Structures are given as structure tokens and as C-alpha cells.
A paper describes a structure:
Cyanobacterial aldehyde-deformylating oxygenase (cADO), which catalyzes the conversion of Cn fatty aldehyde to its corresponding Cn-1 alk(a/e)ne, is a key enzyme in that pathway. Cyanobacterial aldehyde-deformylating oxygenase (cADO) belongs to the superfamily of ferritin-like di-iron proteins and contains a di-iron center. To gain insights into the reaction catalyzed by cADO, we determined structures of wild type ADO from Synechococcus elongates PCC7942 (Se) with different treatment (WT0, no treatment; WT1, co-crystallized with iron; WT-HP, soaked in H2O2), and solved the structures of two SeADO mutants (Y122F and F86YF87Y). SeADO belongs to the di-iron protein family, with conserved sequence of two EX28-29EX2H motifs, in which six conservative amino acids from four helices (Glu32 from helix H1, Glu115 from helix H4, Glu60 & His63 from helix H2, and Glu144 & His147 from helix H5) act as metal ligands.
Each asymmetric unit of WT0 crystal contains one SeADO molecule, and its active site appears to have lost both of its iron atoms. The WT0 structure is characterized by losing the di-iron cluster and by exhibiting a distorted conformation of helix H5. By contrast, the helix H5 is unwound in the middle in the structures of WT0 and molecule B of other three structures (WT1, F86YF87Y and WT-HP), forming two short helices (H5A and H5B) that are connected by a loop L5. The helix to loop transition results in a different conformation for a number of amino acids (from residue 144 to 150), thus the two iron-coordinating residues (Glu144 and His147) move away from the di-iron site. As a result, most of our SeADO structures with the L5 conformation lose their metal atoms. However, in the WT1 and WT0 structures, the electron density is consistent with a ligand with one single-head-group configuration, which is unlikely to be a fatty acid. We assume that if the loop conformation of helix H5, as revealed in the F86YF87Y structure, was not restored into a helical structure at the appropriate time, the solvent-accessible di-iron center may become unstable. Whereas the instability of the di-iron cluster further promotes the loop conformation, and thus results in a complete loss of the di-iron cluster, as shown in the WT0 structure. The structural flexibility of SeADO provides an explanation for its low iron occupancy, and may be in part responsible for the low enzymatic activity observed for cADO.
Numbering used by the authors: 9 to 231
Amino acid sequence: ELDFQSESYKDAYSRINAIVIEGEQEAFDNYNRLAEMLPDQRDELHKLAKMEQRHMKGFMACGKNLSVTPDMGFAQKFFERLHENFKAAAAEGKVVTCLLIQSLIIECFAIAAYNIYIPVADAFARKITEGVVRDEYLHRNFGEEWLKANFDASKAELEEANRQNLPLVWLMLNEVADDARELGMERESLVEDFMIAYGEALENIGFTTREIMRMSAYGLAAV
Ligand SMILES: CCCCCCCCCCCCCCCCO
């Protein structure tokens, strides 16, 4: 009983949908830079970027389906600080920090958003998103397997990158709140599903329960 036609919904949608398009666009780029920095896995590293471009096109289609023009300007600025950190990190061969930003933080944020979105999405959008989500399950998380295979060498930079970057996702959660509520996506649910995905991700890489509690609390304990 959400009105996908009303002006509130389309308005909030212009920004939310833009965020996802932009996030996919930057994932595409990011996974290309990662293809350079790790030329060795560039094959698998190139397949993911392409996959996100597909996903990006899908969400664009979700936009026209609702006859909504996505505010791509607002979306660019939503990702800017994290995009800056990724760029700077990338410049300096800091591949661990790049993977944490893209493979862990960005992709946990998206998986959380997609699952909250589905049960309240319109028919077309729900289909695309179910597809996107399936694609994410049925492919290895590259950066996560890498970081895991390389944990001891990467542990310290990860903790640092987590301190530099986790708070920015926290800002993004607060910024996206109003509009997401309009779409029927509860803010509490998003924070919850994010932490669950991120915490599990940090476990898989090699962090202990105590380390995971410490690292997860870095955004919210400042708030
Ligand atoms: C039309 C999609 C609805 C879900 C919107 C989620 C609200 C904000 C989260 C955006 C996260 C974008 C990350 C994409 C990265 C891709 O790998």
C-alpha cells in the first residue's frame, strides 16, 4: 500500500535510486583499479566490474520504470569522501584499504539495502534486485578471500582503514534515512543488516569476536 506514483515516493526515489546507480558505477571503476593493482587476478577482477555495470543498468531501468530522474549529483556527493579515500589509497598501492572500502564496507551496505528493499519494492524493481542479490551470492567475494588468504600481512592496515572509513558509512546511513523511510525501508533494519553482513565479513577474513565488536562499534560509539 505504498504509492509508487505519489510525489513523496518519486522524490525520495530520485535520490535513493541515484545512490545505487552511482555506487554501482564506482564499484565498476574500483574493480578496474583493483584489476591493475593485482594484475594477476585481473580476469576475475574484470568479471566483477562488468557484473556491477550490468547491475547499474538494471537499477537505471528501475528508475525509468517509475518515470523518475535520478539526482546523480546528489549521489556523487553522497559517495565522495569514500571515493576520495579509495582513490588516495589506490594511488599508494594500498590495496588492503581499497578492498576494505569496496569489497567489505560498500558491498555490505548494498547487500543490507537490497534485502530491506525487496519486500517493499514495486514488482519490476523487486525482480531486478532479486537478480542482483542472487548474482552476489553465487560469486566469490574477491577482496574478502584475498584479505583472508593474506590476513597477517593486512591486519594492521585493515584496522586503520576501518577507523578511517567506517564512520563515513555511518554518516551515509543517517543521510539516507529519511528518503529510505519514504520507500518503506526502516533505518534500524538497515543498520542491523549492515552490521550483520560486515561483522560476518570481518570474521571470515580472520578477526576475533572481540576484535569484531571493537571494530563495529567505531561508528556508533561516537554518536
Ligand atoms: C533501488 C535500490 C533500493 C536500495 C537502496 C539502498 C539505500 C542506500 C544504499 C546504497 C548502497 C550502494 C552500494 C552499491 C555498490 C555495489 O557494489
